[PDB]
């Protein structure tokens, strides 16, 4: 089967550069034109740039013209978008995806990498708990979590007992503080027989700063 | 460019109706439109190509037709999993463009929120600040009120609050609200409440707890 990976995106400088790639397996590279879209927090698609399969050919939207580079080393199956002279309107998750030369349409896509673009400092998570008690227990149900605070930039991943337990949990969407810094919570409900059995540990990670914590959750 | 107009911008129907879904060009894009989904954290997934056609392994109960300017996609029977971003896209000619998009949303009976409280934690308190979170707990509609009270004042401007997307099984949402002070603050007050409003509620539901 097919799979594009990316990888390069992080936090950047207005005025600096970075370039991203995509690695690209189960199919043959060469043989098709590829294409970086884009996609800014909360809004909808933006083509970036197209590339032909031997790359002799490129295409730019007109808000990257003379910015960014488009390129490919078939030998190395890999794609890339050299970006320079970042704006803050740069910010986005980037995607690679794969072009059908009849039918025009992108038929398949990587998951995508983060870029920010920014002057504001990384900064890792604190990670308090939300501690189950009679005032979060609803009749046999009760309920925990983890805030993990004031961080930069995005992303955080937070799983629960490893990746164990995934029913009832609720990562929330990361808001963004009037400190210019993020904060998200994830919540599970729980048996409230099970406050006194189980453990419920809570991994965060924060790639960006290098920052992992795994919290564990006792009843108040 | 070729300008893609998507309508509606939301679309709201019940679990099991039948989901239309229109997108006109600006100029005839032949038949080189294609439709995509995209569901909360990640990539869009190509549904149909060359106007009609189902890419593989995409469901039977999705479909596209039209040519020139007018397009549609069809979602035969809404099923809960089809809460996305539905997104069309040509490439008749440079630069390759899309719609703005189609949230499709499914409209579940009202459930009222669970409600919970949670008290600032000992560690955060020892570094100066105390933040309480609410949470409310898979609910519909996505519509609801929370108010924090300390000692009976309204907090305003010093809370942020988050809803998830809509659960892709039961059709709910979930929403959690942090309210941050100073730990000197936290320790001049007693009585910390969380207040909900919502339609699936007679009245508000408060939980609250004292610090002391």
């Known amino acids: 089967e097919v799979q594009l990976l990316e990888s390069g995106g992080g936090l950047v400088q207005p005025g600096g550069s970075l370039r991203l790639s995509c690695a690209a397996s189960?199919?043959?590279?060469?043989?098709?034109?590829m294409s970086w879209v884009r996609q800014a927090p909360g809004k909808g698609l933006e083509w970036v740039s197209a590339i032909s399969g031997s790359g002799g050919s490129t295409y730019y939207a007109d808000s990257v013209k003379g910015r960014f580079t488009i390129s490919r080393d078939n030998s190395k199956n890999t794609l890339y978008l050299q970006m320079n002279s970042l704006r803050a309107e740069d910010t986005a998750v980037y995607y690679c995806?794969?072009?059908?030369?009849?039918?025009?349409?992108?038929?398949?896509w990587g998951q995508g990498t983060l870029v920010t673009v920014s002057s504001a400092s990384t900064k890792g998570p604190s990670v308090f708990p939300l501690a189950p008690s009679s005032k979060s227990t609803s009749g046999g149900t009760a309920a925990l979590g983890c805030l993990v605070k004031d961080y930069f930039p995005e992303p955080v991943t937070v799983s629960w007992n490893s990746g164990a337990l995934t029913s009832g949990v609720h990562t929330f969407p990361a808001v963004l503080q009037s400190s210019g810094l993020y904060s998200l919570s994830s919540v599970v409900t729980v048996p409230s027989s099970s406050l006194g059995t189980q453990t419920y540990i809570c991994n965060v990670n924060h790639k960006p700063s290098n920052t992992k914590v795994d919290k564990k959750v006792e009843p108040k | 460019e070729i300008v893609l107009t998507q309508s509606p911008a939301t679309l709201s129907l019940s679990p099991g109706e039948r989901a239309t879904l229109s997108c006109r060009a600006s100029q005839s894009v032949s038949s080189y439109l294609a439709w995509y989904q995209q569901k909360p954290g990640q990539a869009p997934r190509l549904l149909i190509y060359?106007?009609?056609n189902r890419a593989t392994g995409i469901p039977a109960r999705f479909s596209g037709s039209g040519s020139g300017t007018d397009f549609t996609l069809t979602i035969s029977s809404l099923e809960p999993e089809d809460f996305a971003v539905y997104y069309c896209?040509?490439?008749?000619?440079?630069?390759?463009?899309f719609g703005q998009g189609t949230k499709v949303e499914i409209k579940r009976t009202v459930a009222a929120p669970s409600v919970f409280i949670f008290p600032p934690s000992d560690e955060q308190l020892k570094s100066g600040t105390a933040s309480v979170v609410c949470l409310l707990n898979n609910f519909y509609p996505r519509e609801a009120k929370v108010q924090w009270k300390v000692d009976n004042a309204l907090q305003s401007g010093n809370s942020q609050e988050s809803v998830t997307e809509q659960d892709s099984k039961d059709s709910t949402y979930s929403l959690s609200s942090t309210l941050t002070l100073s730990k000197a603050d936290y320790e001049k007050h007693k009585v910390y409440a969380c207040e909900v409003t919502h339609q699936g509620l007679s009245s508000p539901v408060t939980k609250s707890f004292n610090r002391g």
């Open positions: 189960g199919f043959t590279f060469s043989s098709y034109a």
């Open positions: 060359d106007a009609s």
């Open positions: 995806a794969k072009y059908d030369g009849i039918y025009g349409e992108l038929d398949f």
């Open positions: 896209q040509q490439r008749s000619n440079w630069p390759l463009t």
